[PDB]
Amino acid sequence: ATMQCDVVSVKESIYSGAVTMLIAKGAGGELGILPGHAPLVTLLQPGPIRVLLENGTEEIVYVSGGVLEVQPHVVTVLADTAIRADNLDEAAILEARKNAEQLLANQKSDLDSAAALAALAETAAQLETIRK
Amino acid sequence: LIIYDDLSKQAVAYRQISLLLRRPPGREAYPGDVFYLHSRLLERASRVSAEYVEKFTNGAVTGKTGSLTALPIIETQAGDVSAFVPTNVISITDGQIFLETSLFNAGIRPAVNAGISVSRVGGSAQTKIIKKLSGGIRTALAQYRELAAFAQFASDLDEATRKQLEHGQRVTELMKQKQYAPYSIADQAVSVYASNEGYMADVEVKKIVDFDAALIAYFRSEYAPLMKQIDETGDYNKDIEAAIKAGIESFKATQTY
Amino acid sequence: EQAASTDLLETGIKVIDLLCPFAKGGKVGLFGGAGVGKTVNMMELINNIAKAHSGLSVFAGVGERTREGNDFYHEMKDSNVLDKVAMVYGQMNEPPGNRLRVALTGLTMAEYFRDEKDENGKGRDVLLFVDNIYRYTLAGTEVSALLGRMPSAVGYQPTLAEEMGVLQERITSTKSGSITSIQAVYVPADDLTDPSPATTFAHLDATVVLSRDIASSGIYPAIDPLDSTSRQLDPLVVGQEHYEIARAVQNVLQRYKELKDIIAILGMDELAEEDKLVVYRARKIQRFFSQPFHVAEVFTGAPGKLVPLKETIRGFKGLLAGEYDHIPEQAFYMVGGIDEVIAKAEKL
Amino acid sequence: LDPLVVGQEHYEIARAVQNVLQRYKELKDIIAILGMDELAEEDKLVVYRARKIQRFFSQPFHVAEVFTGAPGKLVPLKETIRGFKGLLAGEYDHIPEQAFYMVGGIDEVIAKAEKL
Amino acid sequence: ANLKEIRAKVASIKSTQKITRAMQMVAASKMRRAQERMAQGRPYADNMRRVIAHLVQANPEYKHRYMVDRPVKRVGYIIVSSDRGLAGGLNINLFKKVVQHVKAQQEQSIEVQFALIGQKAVSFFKNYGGKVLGATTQIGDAPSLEQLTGSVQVMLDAFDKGELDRIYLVSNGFVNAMTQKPKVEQLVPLAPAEEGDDLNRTYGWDYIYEPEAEELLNGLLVRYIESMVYQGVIENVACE
């Protein structure tokens, strides 16, 4: 019986009820009840982490990237609500350079680097806010 | 049955005659007794008992009653129903049918305002089939009146309320008709049964009138004997319900509007 | 001549005796049109007054429709209530001089019924129904116009208040007996500022508002439990316990009214225990307000219940406390008193 | 104005025009209290078509040239029907409403819009 | 002041009140839905705090790249706003406060950059001009995390390239139903920490961290920073 097992990729979490033995996909040889100390933290394969709950009960364990930190009386897993990627910056720049530029249009053509420009005009927007 | 095309012009003529007699004036120049003028006329539309008929005819007619129906018409200025004569006449009748200028321009041809229109006699003046089938119209229209303002944002509403709104829209469109083309009891019953049972949830809102006209036309050429039984008798029986259902199913199966 | 201390008249109806208690010698305003069983309530009051207080009743119609009068007469004959009531009709097709002086004709009969001494005195308690006093004021206005009196303020007889004091004052609780009165009131143009309703409301002691919504709901009577008021619902005259019981049921109903829009638009799927409990208690109270009458026994086949006030107070206290949080809500429909509810519940 | 007298197309055109204008007559208060953006697109179309229709019913007269100084115009019935049928259909939805003023016939609308 | 126009105006105001009340109850329903949503995000928040405490206790002896401190030079910010209007003016209040802060920075001889997430922010700031690296809009209520990783990642890259020295969150934190405070709070503090407890009872053995001896920290902190930027996003959704 494991003390507790939780995964937190979204506003809610998936809890495990008294895991009778701690088996996980990509176990690494330290699978089982608390060893007195965890060996390490590892990037578990996005393959779903097969885990048998109390009395060897299997549950839907589909993972999209699993980081597991077992501990004496503590088992915590960090997982992805979505497919996991390492340095996904290339798609980030792809999205940024295509959506903003299309959205901005003249806003990007202007690209007025000045920030404290026409501060009285921002105060004019403020006075409009003052207007009913 | 008697119909007075306008009682407002009669009131104006009475006012003119009285003012020429210099009788004491009043609100809007009307004389002292304007309520009596229309009350004594509109109280003569009544149903008499068989005993009264027998006494009047000295026995020449037995076991028969009589009935006079009245439909006065009154014109109001700019929508003001609080004027003198309209308020005098509203309190006398047993009901009121309200026609709105905005509804007329909006496309509602018979242009009745169901919200304020009332009938004191109620369901006591209907055939059995009409009285049985009438409730699903009032329920739907009341629900649509309550939920009308939610048209813009409807996805957030649950499915039941959306279905009620769609049914209200379809019913409100079915209520349209054409002048010089009165419907019969059988057509009204068939249309109301098709509406209540939900066979027109499939159809588009815009094409309600065409579907209704085509369905009525098919029945009067295919199920005319059933219609004859409904028209003469008017009684609603399990067999009549089954026949109506089967006919509507056949029309929906094989026809193109 | 008349000495009175506030003394409630017990009709036997639950909602009225709880939220809008009457008073021997009071005047009551009835609000609502047709389709809500107004005549049924009037018949029930006529029957109950004679059943409990040995009191006869008088009916006076001011400008009544002939068809409605015929229906009322035939239905009262059918319900075996006509033996205890008198009738005076004033029809629309008559000149205004007739529809004006008919309330006095009914009042004379009611006053005579009051002053008939029983053995060991004790007079009698009698009632008086006036079909519509708005038409009484209009009859006065038309008569004044006919005689040529100059118009007052906004198209109303120079002499309007004096006349309504002549009528309404005579309905009082004297030493040897009492006369109450139930009157239906029409508000012209939805204007309480209009002189006629303003002159009317200065004499009323209670207002009963009949709602079409509750009638459509299927609970009869449909008397509104949030818009009806009284001048006897104070901690002094009616007793403290009654006062806070009525106040508690009123704000519970108020909360339910404020919440029913949300409960009807987006359903009950929201998660909040407290308002759900408020909803259930409101529904139980709404059903409990209904009761069967002795006028419909003939057409219904079920007997009536003249529930005493104490049982209503005790049952409402128990319902508010939370003791009857297990009884199904269907066990309160048309169930008379409090205990009956329990058996009805144990029957299920 | 009866389907038996004027015909069938004329009646539908007139009713659709009156319906559009009546619908636009009731959307002013909502635009005021809440932004124009708030109303759905099915009402943006009605508002814009109502404005275009309100200006397209304008034409210059032969008699009243002393006031404005613009030459007079005359339009036959069939041109009116054709133009309004095209307008209610959603065509001419890209032409600015400033080209429907004292322009008379549709082809003149097209030319005046081109000049702008 | 004729009676006809008064009557028409009363009718129209009654109708408009109907629509505005419908809007009010829809907003109230989504308001309860948000109250729950955040109520669910609060445990997401404290377990983010738990995991970052875990990592900072797991290896505070080494030094992270984010730890480096250099003088301020062209610091850019992150701004978030709404899609539709009728927001009561909290967006404008946020814009006023952030423009005052960036103008103070300009007077300190440092120019600023920013990213825009709300449609109103895009329309307003760019109408008066500005400096932006990336932006997005129409993400909708409760949007996917992958939708908005672009802005945070591009600004983290800009900091990596050395042009960007610091970034602070700019949003409206929830206080009460009616009280919303514009907040300009830093977001990349070099991730400092200091724990004087839980080392006695545990963490003496720590771990071999075979997969990543020191590499994992940066991934944990990028997940962390996207976590509170998502928290601020849902927060501003709730208060709007």
TrEMBL record, chain A:
Major localisation: membrane
Membrane topology reported for the UniProt record: Peripheral membrane protein
CDD domains in alphabetical order: F1-ATPase_delta
The ATP synthase F1 complex delta/epsilon subunit N-terminal domain, residue ranges: 3-82
GO CC field: plasma membrane; proton-transporting ATP synthase complex
Domain of life: Bacteria
GO molecular function, one term: hydrolase activity
Places the protein is found: Cell membrane
Keywords: ATP synthesis, Cell membrane, CF(1), Hydrogen ion transport, Hydrolase, Ion transport, Membrane, Transport
SUPFAM superfamilies attached to this UniProt entry: Epsilon subunit of F1F0-ATP synthase C-terminal domain, Epsilon subunit of F1F0-ATP synthase N-terminal domain
InterPro entries on file: ATP_F1_dsu/esu_C_sf, ATP_synth_F1_dsu/esu, ATP_synth_F1_dsu/esu_N, ATPsynth_dsu/esu_N
Function: Produces ATP from ADP in the presence of a proton gradient across the membrane.
HAMAP family from the UniProt entry: ATP_synth_epsil_bac
Oligomer and partners: F-type ATPases have 2 components, CF(1) - the catalytic core - and CF(0) - the membrane proton channel. CF(1) has five subunits: alpha(3), beta(3), gamma(1), delta(1), epsilon(1). CF(0) has three main subunits: a, b and c.
Similarity comment text for this entry: Belongs to the ATPase epsilon chain family.
Protein name: ATP synthase epsilon chain
Organism: Acinetobacter baumannii
Lineage of the species this protein comes from: Bacteria, Pseudomonadati, Pseudomonadota, Gammaproteobacteria, Moraxellales
Automatic annotation (TrEMBL), chain D:
Superkingdom classification of source: Bacteria
Cellular localisation: Cell membrane; Membrane
Organism in which the protein naturally occurs: Acinetobacter baumannii
Lineage, highest ranks first: Bacteria, Pseudomonadati, Pseudomonadota, Gammaproteobacteria, Moraxellales
Gene: atpD
N-terminal signal peptide: none
Function: Produces ATP from ADP in the presence of a proton gradient across the membrane. The catalytic sites are hosted primarily by the beta subunits.
Annotated protein name in UniProt: ATP synthase subunit beta
Positions of transmembrane segments: none
Family, as annotated: Belongs to the ATPase alpha/beta chains family. T3SS ATPase subfamily.
